[PDB]
Design a protein around this ligand. Structure first.
Ligand SMILES: Nc1ncnc2c1ncn2[C@@H]1O[C@H](COP(=O)(O)OP(=O)(O)O)[C@@H](O)[C@H]1O
Ligand SMILES: Nc1ncnc2c1ncn2[C@@H]1O[C@H](COP(=O)(O)OP(=O)(O)O)[C@@H](O)[C@H]1O
Ligand SMILES: Nc1ncnc2c1ncn2[C@@H]1O[C@H](COP(=O)(O)OP(=O)(O)O)[C@@H](O)[C@H]1O
Ligand SMILES: Nc1ncnc2c1ncn2[C@@H]1O[C@H](COP(=O)(O)OP(=O)(O)O)[C@@H](O)[C@H]1O
Ligand SMILES: Nc1ncnc2c1ncn2[C@@H]1O[C@H](COP(=O)(O)OP(=O)(O)O)[C@@H](O)[C@H]1O
Ligand SMILES: Nc1ncnc2c1ncn2[C@@H]1O[C@H](COP(=O)(O)OP(=O)(O)O)[C@@H](O)[C@H]1O
Lengths: 252, 252, 252, 252, 252, 252
């Protein structure tokens, strides 16, 4: 259902503490961090330690949904509202009612939908597309982005008013290269997962871990997880020394 | 339905007085001010103290609507008028008939629509897109911007004739850093709202308020409101001293 | 339907006389003047005292129409001619057939359209976009600009041949600061309009009028009209002395 | 059922070894290579040396399926879900259950489907379109592309999280011009196939093979195969010298 | 049943020779040439000099069939498979079994069908739409296009793998303006056809033929044939001099 | 049964002469002209001066028939062939056998039917829908369009091969504004028809006719005919002066 946030670093301890405060509340959470830094972990963790911990956790990827269809995605539609509406559709909001709604990559939401998202977050009502029946929403909002929202406000690509509405309780996730002291602990967690799930086993020697601690991690912890995965295929139940690392991971 | 304009400053008192004069009239109101300075408050307040106080308050965000779709947004469309017009559409004007129409960020309206907006404000008739049936409009106009419209007229990005039509009764909203004497009063209002709505409680000590009075407030009163919100999560029913302020807010 | 040109100045009397000569004819009229100087008044007045006084008065704002769409604007289009042409479109020319076509800010027409406008003004036929069916046009041309067309010819931004075609009967409109002797008469007209239309009433005292006669009037008579409007809100049925003028209007 | 990977080059030997490791596992395989480099060979070979070697090998061409229909393609649909759904439809996943699912040109999958593909690869359940019954999936994933996925992640056209999920065990296929030492061996295989299948026979002389080893091979081994085919029509049971090569293949 | 390829030019002699080689074989033939260059002649000629010369010659115009119906066109369908399937349908493949299948304008086949066409050309089996019964196909493939397939591969509008499958034995048909030395011979053939079929008679004088040899022939030999036809109506049993040519055909 | 082509203009005399040549023949006639230019007159006239002058004149409006039903329209159907085929149906071809078949607005025939129309015009046989019994056709083809077929060939919306088949003997009908010298003669014919049929009488004075000669005639001679009709209602047995013309017809 949820994962815990492994790590010994100051920054990761800050996150844990900030998670305890806000989870129980219904404050809107905005999580800032590079891709793979554990933003969805924090979000799903928040939820199950929240007033809505029995209700629905509803993802919405505001960027991977075609702009023309995002309104129908969020509120739903009845029929005839547009070409192809053969049937009725519940939206994310509907499906999230009584739970948390997770707005994944909020910085990719089109401006038209930013406006409508704000009106709903204010009025707490919405119209399905086509229908003019307004409808009540009960949702705990959690949003995540890796974009600089402040710059986007300046560029006129993100709305100031939405921003201040969503950014009530900001949580910043450090990128992996800024918490390399967490790598060993993260490696252990990632390997237990793999073993618990009967996918395989490995472990890393000290030289390897030193080498990994010097890596960039553009893909951060997800990249880390992928590497564990590849090495378990390549050296099942092996020990990984620096010679078992792929070249781009060696830094001696 | 509406909020009142808290504040003790000379400028905010000017606004109140200017609001009393014009509200009862059907003069077009143009409100100039930075984002978060209470322009929508003034507008919604104006409306409910106006001849249309029973009719519809209809927002239109002239910038957050894609340019190609703004004409359909304002006047409506019938069918077939363009790709996707499966159905009929009432426009903002229609929905605003008998009430006030609020043109949010008028300085982001495309030039084509400035022309058509003026013709309607003059002729007081409009065509739905596609249809050639002209239609009567009864609307009290209220517009708001944070852009320098005079410069835009010079740059050829805003029309002179629209400007003089809309700028009958100009209301200027001071930014927060120019009315810091209002901050305590604003804090009290913002906190009563939060308590009345069972979201929480706080209050600020004198040192904190002095510190806040030295802040820039790029996001003005909306930024202020957001800060109250965060601190209510962080210190429920607490007292905020300068050490409870986020670093960027401390100025001693 | 039309307004008359109030004013006692030599220049405004010249315009009146020049209007009498040309109106009855089908000569092309070019009206030069700063924004708000009454160029559209002269044009609409010309029309209803012309051979086409029963036919359509068709505005076209050559600058407020996106360049890529101006050709479709003028001649019309059939279908398929470009992206989005779901339907048929009559152009301004079509709609102006049997009336006058008013080219507002001709100095903002793109060079491609200057060429096509000239060929039509010569051949007196045109193709809808897409179609290759040529079509007959019966239009009295009236154009207006506040740009120096002669300089634009030099800069290569306005065509010499179009210019000489349109500039058959040039009418120059003096800016307001060059006919301040007309201000009182203009004030009276502007106030009767307001009263006739049940919008309010005011009048100005002599000191106020002296002060107004010393003003720059960047927006000329439209600016004047706007001021009358604001003061009618601020001092309904009042008398305006120089203390009732906005500061930028006081010159004693 | 499957082909073996002929070739003496270092790179092709690497592939063979990497194929032995991963085939027996259920790790996701991503194969990178230009068109015609044998990516489908590697995939079909992998399968029949895998835990699913008795189950279904199910191709899906993520680019040749219209975007609007790809969701129905993968998961299936019940009825009424959209226009034309007269009947029920099993999806690729269903048909691949117990076997391997081969995602041909994964880099052409639309972003909406990347999201849904990832959720299924994680949750290991899916909804047929229309239905809300979730369903279990047992599939070994194999994907292939000739696109630079890393650039696409940067361009925002391919998702980072999908990428790291699919790229557990990357196999890179060298283009033919980088393994020209394999051409003779490839020629022999391609000719035995043709003879075994009673389509004809040829062989190449040394001069011809030298000439072929200097060719670009934009279409790589598939292009090679096509050339063998044409020459068997043109010179049945002949010997191909450089004069029997098409001009663009001669390099002396 | 078939026509022979008249002409004295080098290129037309090449075609004849290439036709002799491939006709007897079951190699796939791809014929490239502008519209009216005799691609269907070459195809029908090929067939009756082929192993399938007693079997069915089955045209399919891959562009003139609506995309949504092309799959049913090729493989057939049973019933219920979609809206309107009241009955059973044999596809082109079925009807072509034991003969040649001619894919006219292959470059207009939608990508979905390119994929399915290739799988059938490989597996040599197919499913009628709806049915899941697979079925054996015995067909000699002949395809024709006037499109640049290589560019289409680049544009991602034609598949590389289909291309290399179909392009085993490429036949290029020169446009008429590149074989004007064939025009007289072509004229004689076209006129004998007309006489043999009791439609009329003409012949051309030398001046006329010189004039025709300087023509563009956008429609090539079909255009030529049409001209013969018109002139036989206009000058029955006449002699055509350059004055009997339509203006666009005169080049002296 | 037929009308004669009144008119004194060069172009109308050309048509008459071209009608004499082709009528007696069985050449396919293509008539190009704007709506209302007398294309059906030419066609019906052609027929009764043709080898089929005793047989059936069979109209088919290729655009006003729903695309899905046009095949059944042309060839007929047996039963069961599709939903609703309770009975047998003869097609236009059948009903036209021994006469002329008039393809009205051929440029609106769907591409699928262009293909089938050509095969029939070549093979001279056809299948009723459903049946597989082929059937002999004896028809003289006459087609008419107001579309640019050459452009449609370019746009891929009309087939090149059909075009060259149908365009054996092209007849172009000038629009009315290009033969205004024919208007008086046309008026006389149109009025005699009306009198002969006891519908009324009028005649036009010289001023009126001059005015009509300056009109656009978008609807050409049909528009002319309609005007005669309206004026006979409005001024029975009257004389029409320019004041009896509708405004849009006055040009002095
Ligand atoms: N602190 C952490 N402790 C344990 N696992 C983590 C941590 N941070 C990230 N992960 C794991 O890393 C991977 C990607 O994290 P994810 O939450 O998807 O990041 P994001 O949403 O920011 O891209 C998942 O496997 C996740 O469980
Ligand atoms: N003078 C004021 N008194 C009370 N509340 C105010 C005042 N000015 C602004 N607010 C509050 O500040 C926030 C933002 O104001 P808003 O009207 O949205 O500004 P704008 O439209 O200019 O961005 C809202 O919470 C609003 O109620
Ligand atoms: N001489 C005049 N007499 C009366 N009204 C005038 C005169 N000149 C201008 N106006 C008024 O001034 C305003 C703007 O004039 P307009 O014709 O729009 O100028 P332009 O087209 O040059 O910008 C309108 O209210 C118009 O009726
Ligand atoms: N190493 C190899 N040994 C034998 N045949 C090969 C090899 N590589 C490719 N082929 C053959 O080349 C052709 C195209 O390969 P394919 O697997 O379709 O490549 P891709 O899927 O990358 O386009 C097929 O005929 C295939 O059997
Ligand atoms: N070399 C040739 N000899 C005789 N007739 C030819 C020749 N090439 C084309 N034709 C004739 O030209 C016309 C059109 O040719 P067609 O095969 O339909 O070309 P395509 O299929 O390339 O459009 C037909 O009348 C055909 O018989
Ligand atoms: N040259 C002509 N002489 C007499 N009548 C004509 C002539 N041309 C057109 N008409 C008449 O004009 C009307 C419309 O012509 P029609 O043949 O229907 O044109 P189309 O088929 O091109 O639309 C009919 O009343 C027809 O009889």
């Amino acid at each position: 259902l949820f994962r815990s946030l492994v790590g010994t670093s100051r920054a990761i301890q800050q996150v844990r503490q900030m998670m305890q405060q806000v989870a129980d509340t219904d404050a809107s959470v905005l999580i800032l961090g590079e891709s793979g830094t554990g933003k969805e972990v924090v979000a799903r963790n928040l939820h199950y330690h929240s007033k809505r911990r029995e209700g629905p956790f509803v993802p919405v990827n505001c960027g991977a949904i075609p702009a023309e269809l995002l309104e129908s995605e969020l509120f739903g539609h009845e029929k005839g509202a547009f070409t192809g509406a053969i049937t009725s559709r519940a939206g994310r909001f509907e499906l999230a009612n009584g739970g948390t709604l997770f707005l994944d990559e909020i910085g990719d939401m089109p401006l038209p939908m930013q406006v409508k998202l704000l009106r709903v977050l204010q009025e707490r009502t919405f119209e399905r597309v086509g229908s003019n029946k307004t409808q009540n929403v009960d949702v705990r909002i959690i949003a995540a982005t890796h974009k600089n929202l402040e710059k986007m406000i300046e560029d006129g690509t993100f709305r100031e008013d939405l921003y201040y509405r969503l950014n009530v309780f900001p949580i910043e996730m450090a990128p992996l290269r800024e918490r390399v002291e967490d790598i060993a602990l993260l490696l252990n967690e990632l390997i237990s997962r793999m073993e618990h799930e009967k996918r395989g086993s490995i472990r890393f020697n000290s030289a390897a871990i030193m080498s990994l601690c010097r890596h960039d991690w553009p893909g951060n912890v997800r990249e880390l997880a992928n590497l564990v995965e590849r090495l378990a295929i390549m050296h099942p139940y092996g020990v990984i020394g620096v010679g078992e690392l792929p070249k781009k991971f060696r830094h001696v």
